[PDB]
Amino acid sequence: MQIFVKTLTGKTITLEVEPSDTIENVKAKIQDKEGIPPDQQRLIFAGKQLEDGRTLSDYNIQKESTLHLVLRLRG
Amino acid sequence: LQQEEDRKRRSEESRQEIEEFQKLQRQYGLDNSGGYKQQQLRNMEIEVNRGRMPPSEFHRRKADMMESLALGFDDGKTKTSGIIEALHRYYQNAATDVRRVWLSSVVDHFHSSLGDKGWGCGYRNFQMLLSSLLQNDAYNDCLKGMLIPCIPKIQSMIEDAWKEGFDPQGASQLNNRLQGTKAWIGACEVYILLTSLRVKCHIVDFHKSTGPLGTHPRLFEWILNYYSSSPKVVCTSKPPIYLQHQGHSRTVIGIEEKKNRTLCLLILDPGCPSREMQKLLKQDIEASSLKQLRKSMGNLKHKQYQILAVEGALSLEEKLARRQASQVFTAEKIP
């Protein structure tokens, strides 16, 4: 299925994923497209930071859902 | 028929996405809704509207603020001096559970004002670190007696580093603009800022916990190695350490080796108000007052910490080498 990943500057990419994909796998797919190492990625959906060992199905991600991608370590 | 159902689903996903996007942009300071000047004035206007501040002084604090912004200088209203010296006296004189303690050089504490409260931590930790460099003769040439810059000036100086060519990826993450924003920053911005001033520094990325129960012993040991090298209390020449975790940053000004051989960091927080730091300047500190500064491994359980440590000065050639290195921005990783 297709989901979107959107940075806080509005840069948006599309990913091909399955519900069984882990968040770790999703970060790898983001690295495949954008070259951003997974350690620099924090994914947010429904106000919660997604955990690496969980799957997209654990979060009710569905077709055309948008994950928000926070980059690097800031505060 | 499902076409309608698909529309309903996409329409709800969109409302959800738009709502969360605006929330996150605001939190991280990237929604381009103004900056320090606006928040100071808006928050002073609230104090007037709440009958807690006469409109005359508002006119005065606004006038002061505008002068400081024009000069680029921090007005010192959130500055507390003397903490290292007070800690020296305490560890020297008071009965403690410390075998040895290593302190940074003199460091001024800076907390956020009404203008940057909620988002200024990275900038305020830069001010604390800079205050140590500015009293250290080793940095006199590359810092030529500059003053502590105000937050908007720090933002301008980070932009200047981006314009020089530092860290284009990080620049793009922050819309290539910090002035007039409330943008959160990190060690990467502080790094290019200091490097652009010919200050030699580096980031160490403690990207996962290294000890039981989610602790970071490698981080504590790194800091011990930074500060240590005979007396019970050692007030070193060394600058403090910028300490980043997700959402907030602080400044490490020392480390205790307890009598039981465990390690305890001494950490300043730009969220601490003046009245709390003043407690440490009272004749004969209260050991209970020192607890807020003391952080053992149990107190540092964020998943990832980055430190930024300063090591001296750079030649122009070395600065330019580091500018180029910053195009593919990496840091030493531990483990």
Numbering used by the authors:
A (entry chain B): 1 to 75
B (entry chain A): 240 to 468, 473 to 578
Question: What did the original publication write about this model?
Answer:
Here, we describe the biochemical and structural characterization of a seventh deubiquitinase family, which is distantly related to proteases for ubiquitin-like modifiers, but has a different active site architecture and is truly specific for the cleavage of ubiquitin. We provide a detailed analysis of ZUFSP (Zn-finger and UFSP domain protein), the singular human member of this family, which contains multiple UBDs responsible for the specific action on K63-linked chains. The active site Cys and Asp residues of UFSP and ATG4 are conserved in members of the ZUFSP family, while the catalytic His is absent. Human ZUFSP contains four predicted C2H2 zinc fingers related to the ubiquitin-binding UBZ-class, followed by a predicted MIU (motif interacting with ubiquitin) region.
For getting further insights into the unusual active site geometry of ZUFSP and the basis for its K63 specificity, we solved the crystal structure of a covalent complex between human ZUFSP (residues 232–578) and Ub-PA to a resolution of 1.7 Å. The reaction product of thiol DUBs with Ub-PA resembles an intermediate stage of the protease reaction, in which the distal ubiquitin (poised for removal) occupies the S1 site of the enzyme. The ZUFSP structure forms a globular α/β-folded core with two prominent helical protrusions. A long 29-residue helix (α1) points away from the active site and provides the S1 binding surface for the outgoing distal ubiquitin—here occupied by the covalently coupled Ub-PA. The α2 and α3 helices form a hairpin-like structure protruding from the catalytic core in the opposite direction. This region has little contact with the remainder of the structure and might form the S1’ site for binding the proximal (substrate) ubiquitin. As expected from sequence analysis, the positions of the catalytic Cys-360 (start of α5) and Asp-512 (behind β5) are analogous to UFSPs and ATG49,11. However, the catalytic His-491 of ZUFSP is provided by the start of β4, whereas the catalytic histidine of UFSP and ATG4 proteases would have been expected between β5 and α10. The interface most critical for proteolytic activity is formed by salt bridges involving two acidic residues of ZUFSP (Asp-406 and Glu-428) and the two arginine residues within the C-terminal tail of ubiquitin (Arg-72 and Arg-74). A second interaction surface is formed by the second half of the ZUFSP α1 helix, which binds the Ile-44 patch of the S1ubiquitin in an orientation similar, but not identical to that of the Rabex-5 MIU domain.
